[PDB]
Symmetry: C2
Subunit: 61 residues, 2 copies
C-alpha cells in the first residue's frame, strides 16, 4: 500500500508501507482546520486531532 | 501588545504578552503551506519553518 507521507514540517512524498495496510491523515479538529501529517499505518492520536485511516493506495491525499 | 496565539492543535485565542513586544506566526515553508503556530515573542525556529515577527497589536493574523 502506497501512502502520502510528511510531518508538520518535512516534505510530502509518496512511500510504500511495508507491513501496513492503512494510510493516515491527521488534521486539526479546531480552525484553522488543516492537515498536520500523513503517513503509513493508523497511529493513536493526541487530543485536538481528527484522524482518518484508509486502506487503498494513495487514499490519504 | 496583544497577539493571536495557538499551537498546532490548541485553540486560537487572543492574549496579551507581558514583557514582549513582538507577535509571531510560524508557517510551513514547503507545501502544504500553512500556519502551524502563533504566539507572543519571536522564538527561534527549527528547519522547514517560515517565521514572521511583528510589533503591532494583532499583527500575527
Amino acid at each position: 500500500t502506497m501512502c502520502y507521507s510528511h510531518t508538520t514540517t518535512s516534505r510530502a512524498i509518496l512511500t510504500n508501507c511495508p507491513g501496513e495496510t492503512n494510510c493516515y491523515k491527521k488534521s486539526r479538529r479546531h480552525p484553522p482546520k488543516m492537515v498536520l501529517g500523513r503517513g503509513c499505518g493508523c497511529p493513536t492520536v493526541a487530543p485536538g486531532i481528527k484522524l482518518n485511516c484508509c486502506t487503498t493506495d494513495k487514499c490519504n491525499y
